[PDB]
Design a binder for this molecule. Structure first.
Ligand SMILES: CCC[C@@H](C)[C@H]1CC[C@H]2[C@@H]3[C@H](O)C[C@@H]4C[C@H](O)CC[C@]4(C)[C@H]3C[C@H](O)[C@]12C
Ligand SMILES: CCC[C@@H](C)[C@H]1CC[C@H]2[C@@H]3[C@H](O)C[C@@H]4C[C@H](O)CC[C@]4(C)[C@H]3C[C@H](O)[C@]12C
Lengths: 36, 50, 50, 551
């Protein structure tokens, strides 16, 4: 499958490419319905 | 993860992420209030620390 | 699943809807029960054995 | 020097003692953290603190040289501080406090600035039409009478309606009397009579923002023209000042400036279309403004000056009030939020105070603030102090119970009971148990639980959403057995069963589509399915499928 592991600094464009969305609230879960 | 008895166990990274997000949101809100530059400088220092 | 539905159909067996989270002797141990004690909350009914 | 002497031994022995380091340490007073900073700086080349007197070298020279250079800088340093709170105290310890008369001057500066802003927005009375339309819609019962406007500068709805009627009369008698020598006086009178009214901050701000949007559209058009006539054509600014300024409405300054026998005039032929469109938009907007743009420009300049004066005014008020918040904040140091966080949250409540403070009532600020500050600290400690956010109401209730409980314990020499707590409070007892369950803060998953292998608590928490491997083998065994018992059947019935239930496919087709393909009307396909089922039901064709029936 893979034959090497390359390492380098990450550009902001790359960091946005990894992500599936932006976290905007410090919330974790609801305190009664323990749902996200 | 939920534990027995209603207790919850959490990783320390959640605390650090919550710190970062709180200070970032506060900074964004404070930029829109045109606060005195002392406040925004201190907020930026806090964000850097977090 | 698609084959666990057909199996339940042919044999007409319905879902239990409850688990079997019962206490059992640890494997490899063999003794006699010499004592049992039950503690119940205030609002509970204190079943016959209690 | 002193640091170099300390290094001398470090290397000579390969190790040093806390005392010798602290002593050779430059007298340079260090605020603990600084001493902490240098210790690692020395550790960079590698050294053993060892509170007591005494295991190999693995330090790159590059690290070594850099640590040496920074170590030299430490001696030359004066007041290096790597601590935000300390830096804050210093940058704050640079503004003097204000005396009692020191807020009256600031307050009157603020009032004068806001009055100038109000008049400047008042001068542009086109909004009066928008205000009248809003009042008409409100009188159409679209909203409350008292919501649109917070009264007038006078106390009864009838007086407000009379004033609105007079305003409408003046508006109609002034708008339809432009034909110019006296129209300006009519407009001034209309503005003056409108000054006696008071508008809600939201509607006033919306009007200001709409005016700003219009002005920014006009400025965008002007700058587009400037970039299309200067950058592309190198048009001298003198020509623009001479022609564009003075009229600012007609096309003479641009369209009739093409015949100036200059290279820029000829080059304007290429960009005449876009600049002409900009001029058309301006002509319309200039008509919409109905006022000399230069006058408007001066209106905006005065408004900006007033706003800047007001902003710098409160700035100083809030600098002395930053001098404060530090006190109230220290009262919640261990409440689950960090000190600099508490202080910054208080600074926002302080800003909220300064903007809503009236000195006329002669309240000591240091009192129209010590509240706004505490409200903002507590609101925060409640909205962002726990990993699982709790409503402010639930937090109030929990604090009340924790108190009522302390008193009951002191007067009972015994922790109260969920029943006695319910009695002493006014709660249905079950509610008390629900509030007495709201789990406290999540436990740290790295909490040391060791003394054998240095293992943490999170290591012993298992995964409960995993399929056991004898259930993955069992599943594949049924997915096969089913193929056998089913294949041991004729084609059409086997496909009927396959479609009905979903074996090897991607949908549990209902009877309608199965009939479409097999041509029929449900009841027959229902017939084919039932025979198959009763068939696979008899023994001699359902022993292993029976085994898969947990029993
Ligand atoms: C001293 C060694 C550390 C470890 C053995 C101690 C230190 C803190 C203890 C936990 C905490 O109290 C929080 C919970 C309290 C509940 O009642 C029982 C579970 C719970 C996780 C405790 C189990 C255990 O006792 C812990 C992990
Ligand atoms: C020597 C240290 C003792 C350590 C082995 C004991 C002390 C407390 C025990 C944990 C707590 O009960 C909390 C959880 C309860 C779950 O049901 C099972 C996991 C869980 C972590 C427990 C596993 C283990 O039993 C623990 C860690």
């Amino acid at each position: 499958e893979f034959d090497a592991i390359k390492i380098a600094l990450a550009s902001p464009d790359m960091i946005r490419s990894w992500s599936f969305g932006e976290v905007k609230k410090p919330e974790t879960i609801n305190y009664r319905t323990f749902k996200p | 993860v939920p534990l027995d008895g209603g207790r919850f166990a959490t990783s320390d990274l959640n605390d650090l992420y919550r710190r970062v997000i709180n200070r970032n949101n506060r900074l964004k809100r404070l930029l829109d209030l045109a606060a005195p530059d002392i406040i925004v400088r201190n907020e930026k220092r806090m964000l850097q620390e977090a | 699943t698609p084959e666990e539905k057909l199996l339940r159909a042919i044999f007409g067996e319905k879902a239990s809807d409850v688990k079997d989270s019962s206490l059992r002797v640890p494997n490899g141990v063999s003794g006699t029960v010499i004592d049992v004690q039950v503690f119940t909350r205030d609002g509970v009914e204190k079943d016959k054995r209690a | 020097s002193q640091l170099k002497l300390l290094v001398t031994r470090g290397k000579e022995q390969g190790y040093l003692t806390y005392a010798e380091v602290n002593d050779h340490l430059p007298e340079d007073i260090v605020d603990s953290d600084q001493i902490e900073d240098i210790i690692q700086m020395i550790n960079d080349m590698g050294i053993q603190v060892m509170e007591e007197a005494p295991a190999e070298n693995t330090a790159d020279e590059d690290a070594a040289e850099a640590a040496a250079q920074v170590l030299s800088s430490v001696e030359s340093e004066i007041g290096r501080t790597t601590d935000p709170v300390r830096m804050y105290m210093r940058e704050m310890g640079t503004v003097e406090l204000l005396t009692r008369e020191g807020e009256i001057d600031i307050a009157k500066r603020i009032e004068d600035g806001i009055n100038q802003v109000q008049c400047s927005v008042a001068e542009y009375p086109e909004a009066i039409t928008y205000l009248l339309e809003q009042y008409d819609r409100v009188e159409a019962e679209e909203a409350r009478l008292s919501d649109l406007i917070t009264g007038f500068v006078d106390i009864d709805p009838e007086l407000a309606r009379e004033k609105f009627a007079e305003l409408r009369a003046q508006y109609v008698v002034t708008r339809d009397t432009i034909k110019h020598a006296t129209a300006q006086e009519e407009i001034l009178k209309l503005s003056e009579v409108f000054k006696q009214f008071r508008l809600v901050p939201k509607q006033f701000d919306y009007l200001v923002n709409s005016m700003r949007v219009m002005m920014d559209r006009v400025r965008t058009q002007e700058r587009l023209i400037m970039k299309l006539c200067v950058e592309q054509c190198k048009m001298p600014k003198k020509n623009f000042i001479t022609l564009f300024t003075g009229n600012e409405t007609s096309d003479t300054w641009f369209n009739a400036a093409i015949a100036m026998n200059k290279p820029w005039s000829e080059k304007l032929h290429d960009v005449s279309e876009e600049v002409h469109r900009a001029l058309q938009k301006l002509q319309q907007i200039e008509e919409e403004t109905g006022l000399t743009i230069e006058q408007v420009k001066d209106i905006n300049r005065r408004m900006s000056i007033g706003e800047a004066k007001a902003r710098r005014a409160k700035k100083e008020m809030v600098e002395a009030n930053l001098r404060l918040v530090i006190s109230i904040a220290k009262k919640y140091t261990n409440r689950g939020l960090q000190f600099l966080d508490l202080i910054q949250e208080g600074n926002i409540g302080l800003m909220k105070a300064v903007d809503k403070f009236e000195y006329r009532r002669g309240y000591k600020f240091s009192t129209y603030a010590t509240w706004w500050i505490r409200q903002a600290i507590t609101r925060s400690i409640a909205d962002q102090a726990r990993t699982i956010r709790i409503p402010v109401h639930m937090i109030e209730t929990i604090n009340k119970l924790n108190r009522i409980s302390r008193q009951m314990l002191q007067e009972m020499g015994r922790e109260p009971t969920p029943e006695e707590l319910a009695e002493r409070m006014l709660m249905p007892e079950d509610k008390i148990r629900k509030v007495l369950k709201i789990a406290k803060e999540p436990i740290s998953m790295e909490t040391p639980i060791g003394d054998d292998e240095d293992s943490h608590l999170g290591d012993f928490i298992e995964d409960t959403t995993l399929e056991l491997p004898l259930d993955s083998a069992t599943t594949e065994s049924l997915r096969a057995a089913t193929h056998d018992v089913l294949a041991g059947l004729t084609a059409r019935e086997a496909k009927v069963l396959r479609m009905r239930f979903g074996i090897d496919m991607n949908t549990d087709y209902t009877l309608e589509e199965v009939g479409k393909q097999f041509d029929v009307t449900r009841e027959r396909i229902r017939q084919i399915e039932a025979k198959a089922l009763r068939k696979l039901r008899h023994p001699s064709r359902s022993e292993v499928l029976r085994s898969f029936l947990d029993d």
